[PDB]
Each structure stands twice: as structure tokens, then as C-alpha cells.
Design a protein around this nucleic acid. Structure first.
Ligand SMILES: [Cl-]
Lengths: 254, 145
RNA sequence: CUCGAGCCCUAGACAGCCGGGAGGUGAGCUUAGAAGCAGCUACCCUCUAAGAAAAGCGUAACAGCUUACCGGCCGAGGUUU
């Protein structure tokens, strides 16, 4: 049979560490890792920490750990395939699927790819050094003119936007310019709350419509405030502007 | 012309004053006054209201020069010594660059600083190499913690 | 073609393909500049699933291409002798 003889030590230690992480953070979930560069992933882990913690390992070692637990955490296994990693937090599930968006994926766009974002190069002064850089921008986008201190960028217009890929040389002048125009992100495949698992597709919808119903409720009170024949605080200007106003509707009107 | 200049002084002449005239003048003088003098920085164009700036943070190897004295590093590190750098001085260099380091606190940030200090033969007390053990044993906690 | 021995492997090996190979930092010294990679010495430290103070190309020097190292896809043997 193709199983090994003795399970290697580090595989055992890692399953323990993963279980340890899982034990804390009363809300736990699996997300993506998508594809994402190291420095960018660090900066996702480097945002304040202290809210959620990202735990990466082999999908099999994450799946071992969920089987050691599982009073609730078994069903989290069907959501583990692909590149993927564990997340856990003391925070709420609904606030969990947010803040993941916070400072995510600058995405430098290596050559050979199509980005849904705008690759437009702006106008300003970079001026690395007088040289082929003047001609480097010429073979891609709006010309670079050298004015009195160094090379500069003239036109603020677009080079490429969407529907095709990036030039190889552009990718290198986008790297020299320090341009990262793409958005991918760290997804969330599922999460476990108290007794139940939350799939992002259902019940996880989000904020304007809440801020739309929340202002509609405050306007619901001020609409009934002066019709109460009562006295209010901020609604005190109700009668103040109705003093000399509606009085003429019973006098001047008819 | 561009906007940038070293120094921890106030308004070091021609890069700043001449270019900034309408309508902002000298209102940016507060930002570049940082103690170390050098702090090369870059000022972004702004609206008429105030100004906008960012602070470029100097390298770590050169950050320990302005503390430990003579700037020549060790020819043979962990052999010849510069020599010394005080322990609380390292605390200062560590709080200096927050984003330039990946650490979540001063404790680990210090380790990187002293990490580099091995290369220059900085010999913080007895030797830069012993530092990780010492600080992991909670030696210097009075400083950091 | 046959007979052994060791090691690795469904806690997913071997190969391939995809993704990631990060920050202090362009380590110090040398040098006009010596940026993993002319040379001498050291070879620490963080973030990590993991990533050398760089194993090999490459540059006038930086680009740039890989190797180490980690994750995924795949699934049954692989590898040394
Ligand atoms: Cl995937």
C-alpha cells in the first residue's frame, strides 16, 4: 500500500499548531490565498492584525485539524480545495467578510495578463535619469518630454484599459514607474460562527440600503414629531418656521 | 524641476522656496524639521488650503552611524569591532522606521537593527549574535516591555 | 530480462504545469559605483505556508531569467544502490 511507515514529525507538529489556532478565535473560516505576492500578503496580515489571523498550511493538514475539532467544524472540509487558508477572529461573521477588502491587492501586473482595472499612466515628474526612459514611454503611451530638471510626463491620457493584454516592455516601464493597476483580492469560501456555517452566497449580502433604511427611519420620527402636539429637541424648528407660515393658509388663501 | 531635498533643518533654500509661491509659501516648514540631520523627503503638490507631504525614511545601516560614531564598518565583522552601541540607543533606531520593518513591535524591530549590527561589527555589548537569545529570554524587557 | 538492499510515499511521494520565492537590504568591507552573484569578512533578523547576507546563467553597474524553499492542480508508485 502507498501510505508511509511513520508519519513525519513536522506534519504532526503542524496539525497541532493548526488545531491550536483553530481553538482560539471563536469564529473561524477558510478563504482563498487566490494568488497574491508575498509583500502584498504580508501587508494584508500587517493591517493592524489584532482582528483576524491568517493561517496557511497544506489543505490536508488543515483538514486533519478540522477533524480533531468538528463539534461544529466538520462541514468546513467540503470548502477546502485549491490554494486556500484558514482565517479566525473574535469578530462577527458579517463583519468578518468585510475588512478583508481593506488595503488589498495593489497588484503590479506581471506581463502576459489582462487587468479589469485602468492601466492609465498619469502626468507628473519621475525623472529617473536622462536616457532611454524618454523612449521607453514612447513605445507604449503618451510621450515623455524632458523639461529643465529631468524627464517628465506630458499627457494624462490612457495607454491601455481593458479587453487585451499588457506589452512586455510596458510591464517593465510600469514596474519602473511603480504602477500597480489591478484588483483581485482575498476571497472567502465559507465561515463558522456559533452552531452554523455561513456561505457568502446566501445571507451574507451587505450598506447603502441599510443607510437608506436608517435615514428613512429617522425621517419617520420627524414626520410624526410635530403631529404629536408635543415638544422635541432637534424637531424644535418645526413650529419655529411654521409660526408665521401656515397661519396665512387660514387667512390669505381663502 | 522636482520636489525633494535632504536635511532635518527648516526650508533648505532653492528646491522649496522658489517653486512654492502661489499661493502657498513656507507653510510646509514644519514637516522636514525632523531631528536627524538627514531625512530626504518628497512633497506632493496640494490644493491652496495647506500642503501635502510624505517622509522618506533613511536606511538602517546609516541610521546606526549617527549614533555609534565613526561610519566605517568592520572589515571583518565579528572579528574587528567599531565598536559599541548602547542598548537603549537601539530602542531609538527601532521606533524610527515603522513601515520599513515588518515587525509588529519594537522587540522584533530591534532584532533586525541588531541583525544588521552583526554585519558592521557593532558589538552592542559583548556581541551582536547573542542578541536573539538574550531578548527572547526577556533580558531587556525593562526597555521594550 | 531476473534477483536483492536502503530511503521517500494517499498526512499525496517522483515528474510536469500554475502560483508564491517577501522586508530590514542596495548586508558590511573594498570600490568612482560592488546592488545574491569582481574580491575580503561575516552570513545575522523579521514577516511567514515558505523564500539563501544566494546555487547558476546575466549586466559597465542596476535590469532580467532561473535554482534553493512553500502552496495548489494531479493521483500511485518513486528514488538511490
Ligand atoms: Cl486555487
Amino acid at each position: 500500500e502507498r501510505k508511509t511507515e511513520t508519519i513525519p514529525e513536522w506534519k504532526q507538529e503542524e496539525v497541532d499548531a493548526i488545531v491550536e489556532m483553530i481553538e482560539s478565535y471563536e469564529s473561524v473560516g477558510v478563504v482563498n490565498i487566490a494568488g497574491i505576492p508575498s509583500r502584498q500578503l504580508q501587508d494584508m496580515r500587517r493591517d493592524l492584525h489584532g482582528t483576524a489571523e491568517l493561517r496557511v498550511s497544506r489543505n490536508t493538514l488543515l483538514e486533519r485539524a478540522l477533524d480533531d475539532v468538528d463539534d461544529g467544524l466538520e462541514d468546513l472540509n467540503g470548502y477546502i480545495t485549491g490554494q486556500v487558508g484558514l482565517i479566525g477572529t473574535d469578530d462577527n461573521p458579517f463583519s468578518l467578510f468585510q475588512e478583508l477588502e481593506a488595503s488589498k491587492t495593489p497588484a503590479p501586473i506581471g506581463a502576459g495578463e489582462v487587468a479589469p482595472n485602468d492601466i492609465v499612466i498619469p502626468e507628473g515628474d519621475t525623472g529617473v535619469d536622462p536616457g532611454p526612459f524618454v523612449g521607453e514611454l514612447q513605445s507604449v503611451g503618451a510621450d515623455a518630454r524632458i523639461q529643465e530638471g529631468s524627464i517628465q510626463v506630458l499627457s494624462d491620457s490612457t495607454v491601455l484599459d481593458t479587453g487585451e493584454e499588457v506589452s512586455q516592455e510596458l510591464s517593465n516601464v510600469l514596474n519602473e514607474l511603480g504602477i500597480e493597476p489591478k484588483e483581485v483580492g482575498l476571497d472567502l469560501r465559507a465561515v463558522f460562527a456559533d452552531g452554523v456555517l455561513f456561505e457568502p452566497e446566501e445571507l451574507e449580502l451587505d450598506x447603502x440600503x441599510x443607510x437608506x433604511x436608517x435615514x428613512x427611519x429617522x425621517x419617520x420620527x420627524x414626520x410624526x414629531x410635530x403631529x404629536x402636539x408635543x415638544x422635541x429637541x432637534x424637531x424644535x424648528x418645526x413650529x419655529x418656521x411654521x409660526x408665521x407660515x401656515x397661519x396665512x393658509x387660514x387667512x390669505x388663501x381663502x | 524641476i522636482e520636489v525633494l531635498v535632504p536635511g532635518g533643518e527648516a526650508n533648505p533654500g532653492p528646491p522649496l522656496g522658489p517653486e512654492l509661491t502661489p499661493v502657498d509659501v513656507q507653510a510646509v516648514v514644519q514637516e522636514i524639521n525632523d531631528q536627524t540631520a538627514e531625512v530626504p523627503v518628497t512633497v506632493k503638490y496640494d490644493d491652496d488650503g495647506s500642503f501635502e507631504i510624505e517622509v522618506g525614511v533613511p536606511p538602517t545601516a546609516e541610521l546606526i552611524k549617527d549614533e555609534a560614531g565613526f561610519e566605517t564598518g568592520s572589515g571583518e565583522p565579528q572579528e574587528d569591532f567599531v565598536a559599541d552601541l548602547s542598548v537603549d540607543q537601539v530602542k531609538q533606531i527601532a521606533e524610527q522606521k515603522h513601515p520599513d520593518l515588518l515587525s509588529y513591535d519594537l522587540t522584533n524591530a530591534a532584532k533586525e537593527v541588531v541583525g544588521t549590527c552583526t554585519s558592521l561589527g557593532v558589538t552592542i555589548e559583548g556581541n551582536p549574535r547573542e542578541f536573539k537569545e538574550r531578548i527572547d529570554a526577556g533580558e531587556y524587557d525593562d526597555v521594550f516591555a
